[PDB]
Amino acid sequence: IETVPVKLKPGMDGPKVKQWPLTEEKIKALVEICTEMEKEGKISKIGPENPYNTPVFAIKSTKWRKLVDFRELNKRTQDFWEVQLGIPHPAGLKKKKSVTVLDVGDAYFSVPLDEDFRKYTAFTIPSINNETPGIRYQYNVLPQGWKGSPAIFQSSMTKILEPFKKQNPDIVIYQYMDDLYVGSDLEIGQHRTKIEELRQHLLRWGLTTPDKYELHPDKWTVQPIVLPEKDSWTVNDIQKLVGKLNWASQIYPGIKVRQLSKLLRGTKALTEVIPLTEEAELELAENREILKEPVHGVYYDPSKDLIAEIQKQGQGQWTYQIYQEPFKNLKTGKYARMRGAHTNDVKQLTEAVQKITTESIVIWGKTPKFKLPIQKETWETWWTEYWQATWIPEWEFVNTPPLVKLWYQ
Amino acid sequence: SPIETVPVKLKPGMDGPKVKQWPLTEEKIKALVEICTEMEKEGKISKIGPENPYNTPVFAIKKKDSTKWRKLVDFRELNKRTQDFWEVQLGIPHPAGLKKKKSVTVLDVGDAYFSVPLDEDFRKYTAFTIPSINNETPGIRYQYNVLPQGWKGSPAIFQSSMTKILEPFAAQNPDIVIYQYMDDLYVGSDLEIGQHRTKIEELRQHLLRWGLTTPDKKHQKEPPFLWMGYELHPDKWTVQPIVLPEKDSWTVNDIQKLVGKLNWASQIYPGIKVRQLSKLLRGTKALTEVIPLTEEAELELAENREILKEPVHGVYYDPSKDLIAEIQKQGQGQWTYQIYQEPFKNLKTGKYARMRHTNDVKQLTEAVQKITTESIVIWGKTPKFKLPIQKETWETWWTEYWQATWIPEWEFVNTPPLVKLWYQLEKEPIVGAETFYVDGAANRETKLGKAGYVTNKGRQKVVPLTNTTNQKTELQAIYLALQDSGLEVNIVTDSQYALGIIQAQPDKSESELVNQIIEQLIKKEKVYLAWVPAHKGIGGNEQVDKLV
């Protein structure tokens, strides 16, 4: 069929990102995948007059998936293609009781890609020890990972889905890149059969989905801060409490601590149990109530970017906050990975970055930029080992630790 | 040659170079036309008419002072207009990654770029002109038909032409390995020497039919091979001999040229140190300010000359044997490592240095990371690690560290020095221990400061300080509380900076104050540090900020 013309933003030139070094095992899995794709016409080999490049990786099951990092090309294209060809985000998806994620990325491989645009999709399969120049392909069809793919395929998706949308005016469906998020309110058993319906409706219209993952966004809120509950209080407990409550002042204004600062007037020893005054207890109860209520004036701004901060807490427990301006949390959570010591730190941080991204997609229709507590090179090396998603969020690496660790636990 | 051309464009919205052909001396104007008739006859150029409005300067110079003159075209004005090409190979293969082969042959193809055609529609933008004597006649126009010397697209277009020309031969010969590099081919194989030599001669005839020359009488080189500053031997590899200059006066320029050779030799010579010699160049701007060799520096340079005395070698890679890497700590944020498969032969060696006052364990992790990255690039896998650190010592650190840290397969190696946690603060305050309420402060203008403390038992001190910041006094206050307390002390500071440096559990720093604090923390038995907001009227702290 005739191809949708695609143009870059005026003045923007194609991506030119370097290809990371890969394990031999992964390099072979890629050469195998690509020899099969060139056979089916999805990609073709190119010459040296193609100067652009885009990193490729090998993820996983037992089959090797190929993941193309299209983050750079999306900033140079999808921008004028969330504009010219945007996909609206429903504000009712976060309210449904259950939400299943269906992979429908295989639909793009039939639709051809614009002739003048293919050169910007080039990628390289690296050789070990710089022994050979490297195998270079470009795409002839809509690639997975690119955001212009679901945008171009949008009209076909709406057509294939409308028969199902009529017999289910209550089921919400949203398309982000290669995934279909469908939220219902039915019982879990009902919802699970309604999912197998759509899978069969999609399959009998030509869209296979490798299934033969479900979230619950009704609990997703901004978690309340927790002051310690103690029978007796020492001078140190009151000091950790006065410090944390002094920090909370940056978020909830209206906290009072003068009554709790007087309970430490003299320079007493650290392990000296001090009973709380009558005036003292007024604040520990008055401050535990102003803090169980959400904040005032915190609204999502769609013209800004989302920022996600994670911090390691210990024993496979991680806390995170998603915001846009400091101290204005749109969302805060707590990812815990029960693995019984069959996971490491990098594995847990990877799972969290994906649970946080999936949550962020349902609630706002876009992903946040992560500030990761990890060495840059360490992450740039082992993140593909546990990546199970097809999109890739922007990220950067935190330099200094937080003296505010226990202030989120 | 019958090679298929690569289509080339000019950068969007540009036109060919129209440069000024400045008049040249007489004896040269003759030497040029003597080449352009031998290069035209061989089809590499072609006289053109007047329709061509572009041009490029042309010069002439002698061949290292010899018989044949050499033509030279300054394409710098045309390179600025041609489109970008795929970047040619950045790095080169490392000898430690190569696999032992029964025989190796080096083939240098001469005239490389001239043996490859140039896209037709792009040949006009290479037009040039030879000057008529005293502007008497119209200029002898010309233009290239092959890839010109020193053109933006020549190296990349030649590389992809060579690769295609090898495809029909590599398919009929799946037993021989060919690596490419600029104008060179490196053919390896496990064929008996009689076979190998026939394959090489038939590879030459192949390349010869495509119009590419190669050495015949006797291959230009024989092992060992002096390639890219290496010595490649049939069963070992080493760096070309290093020459450390004996000089009684160094320059900021020559320390860079010396630290270079030292880093270079460090990939196979174990033990080379460069911390003291690169410590000189920290405050560098000018290039010729003569530098005193610090006494400490001179020792390192003497210890390097001792390591370089006898030569050492590295082996080649054997994919069938495990890959092992071992790490040793040199001393002052200086680490060394060897990568090997056998006990008496290393694949290669190297060193990690930490810049940016961290501790030993975190430095070790950073080193394991540097080694893991290099292994992938060279051999495509990560090695097993023998590390001089107790498993329990490491589990304690990464468990309480705020960053995620990956620890690949490793086992303990009981070889001093060892990596250990020299001290650990208490997670909960101590009982029966004195509680010091330290604080500090200085003056940014005058740089006069003071530190002190106030304990619960009534003890108090205040010390004057000159030439300090409102930061060094915060550490001076904690040092005071550590000198004047027993073997168990609780400290309470109102400074996140100090609490941050101490909670970072460093074993060395680039400041002498922190080293004395570490010495005290070692001597102590239980030390609980604690933080409270300043100037909040808490208590215990409100009375110490008034003293200072």
**Domain boundaries along the sequence of chain B:** 1-88+114-154, 89-113+155-223, 224-317, 318-422, 423-548
Q: Write the CA distances from B412 to B352, B385, B391, B406, integer angstroms.
A: 20, 9, 7, 16
**Strands B526-531 and B488-493, sheet pairing:** parallel
Query: Does A237 belong to an annotated binding site?
Result: no
Q: After which residues is chain B broken (C to N over 2.5 A)?
A: 356
Chain B: closest CA distance from residue A313 (Å): 8
Task: List the domain range (segments joined by +) for residue A84.
Answer: 5-91+117-157
B474 is in an annotated binding site: yes
- CB A129 to CB B380 under 8 A? yes
Asked if A375 lies within 8 A of B403 by C-beta distance, the reply is yes
- Hey, is the C-beta of B82 within 8 angstroms of any chain A C-beta? no
Residues 387-446 of B with CB under 8 A from A: 398-407, 429-431, 434-435, 437
CA distance A390 to chain B (A): 23
Q: Crossing angle, helix B472-483 and helix B496-503, to 10 degrees?
A: 60
Question: Are residues A201 and A138 part of one domain?
Answer: no
> What is the number of structural domains in chain A?
4
Task: Report how far residue A42's alpha carbon sits from residue A374's, in angstroms, rounded to the nearest whole number.
Answer: 37
Q: Which of B406, B536, B541 has the highest number of chain A CBs within 10 A, making it the mutation to test binding with A?
A: B406
Helix count and strand count (H, E) for chain B = 13, 23
The reply, when asked if residue B494 is annotated as ligand binding, is yes
A234, A265, A377 member nearest B539 (Cβ): A265
Structure tokens at A140: 């002839």
Of B163, B1, B13, B23, the C-alpha closest to B88 is B163
- CB count within 10 Å of CB A46 equals 19
φ, ψ of residue B473 to 5 degrees: the values are -75, -30
Residues A97 and A26 sit within 8 Å (Cβ to Cβ): no
Q: How far apart are CA B374 and CA B377, in angstroms?
A: 5
Q: Are strands A135-139 and A43-45 parallel, antiparallel or unpaired?
A: antiparallel
Going by C-alpha positions, the residue among B47, B165, B35, B56 that lies closest to residue B112 is B165
At B60 the three-state DSSP class reads strand
Q: How far apart are CA B232 and CA B221, in angstroms?
A: 11
The experimental method, as deposited, was X-ray
Residue B296 φ/ψ region, left for φ over 0, alpha for ψ in the -120 to 50 degree band, beta for the rest: alpha
Distance CA B129, CA B126 (A): 10
Of B373, B376, B539, the CB nearest to A261: B539
Question: What is A31-95 written as a DSSP string?
Answer: HHHHHHHHHTTSEEE--TT---B--EEEE---S-EEEE--HHHHHHTTHHHHHTT-----TTGGG
CB-CB under 8 Å, B402 with A375: no
Name the pairing type of β-strands B290-291 and B250-251: antiparallel
> Nearest to residue A322, comparing CAs of A313, A337, A311, A333?
A333
Q: How far apart are CA A281 and CA A241, in angstroms?
A: 13
Pair A311, A221 in one domain: no
Q: How far apart are CA A153 and CA B512, in angstroms?
A: 65
- Three-class secondary structure of residue B351 per DSSP: strand
Question: Phi, psi at residue B221, to the nearest 5°?
Answer: -125, 155
**Residue A336, strand partner residues:** A317
Same domain, A153 and A11: yes
Shared domain for A192 and A270, answered yes or no, is no
Instruction: Give the whole-angstrom CA distance, residue B436 versus residue B479.
Output: 11
**Residue from B200, B205, B206 nearest B165 by CA:** B206
**Which residues are within 8 A (CB) of B494 and not within 5 positions of it... i.e. 6 or more apart?**
B439, B531, B532, B533, B534, B535, B541, B545
**Both A336 and A397 in a single domain?**
yes
A13 is in an annotated binding site: no
Give the residue from A197, A214, A231 where a domain finishes.
A214
> Are residues A407 and A354 part of one domain?
yes
**One-letter amino acid of B370:** K
Distance between CA atoms of residues B6 and A91, nearest Å: 52
B30: tokens are: 């003759």
Give the count of alpha carbons within 13 A of A289, CB side only. Answer: 6
Whole-number Cα distances in Å, A56 to A34, A392, B25: 11, 12, 55
Look up residue A85 and give its two tokens: 């060809």
| A322/A194 same-domain check | no
Q: Which residue has the tokens 């909370």?
A: A248
Q: What gap in Å lies between CA A215 and CA A276, rounded to an integer?
A: 44
Closest CA to B265 of B301, B211, B217, B224: B301
- Mutation site for B-interface testing, chosen from A267, A318, A370 by largest number of B Cβ within 10 Å: A267
Q: Which helix (H) or strand (E) holds A396?
A: strand A395-397
H or E element, residue A194 = helix A188-203
10 Å Cβ neighbour count for A254?
Answer: 9
Side-by-side strand order, sheet with B184-189: B103-108, B184-189, B176-181
Chain A / chain B CB contacts < 8 angstroms: 187
The two three-digit tokens of residue B146, written as one number: 């092959």
Distance, in Å, from the CA atom of B365 to the CA atom of B368, rounded to the nearest integer, reads 5
In this structure, what token pair is assigned to residue A350? 């990877």
Listed resolution, Å = 2.6
CA end-to-end span of chain B: 86
| CB within 8 Å of B444: residues ≥ 6 apart | B469, B470
- B212-215: long-range pairs with CB below 8 Å, 24+: B212/B1, B212/B109, B212/B112, B212/B115, B212/B165, B213/B109, B213/B110, B213/B111, B213/B115, B214/B107, B214/B108, B214/B109, B214/B110, B214/B185, B215/B107, B215/B108
CA distance B113 to B155: 8
Residues in chain A, overall count: 409
Instruction: Read off the DSSP letter of residue B68.
Output: S
| A174 lies in the same domain as A252 | no
CA nearest B183: which of B92, B111, B85? B111
How close, in Å, is residue B96 to chain A by CA atoms? 9
A237 and A105 together in one domain: no
Say whether A258 and B537 touch across the interface (CB within 8 A). yes
| A84 in the same domain as A106 | no
CB contacts under 8 A, B 483-542 vs A, are 490, 492, 496, 499-500, 503-504, 528, 530-533, 536-541
B160 closest CB neighbour out of A47, A242, A405: A47
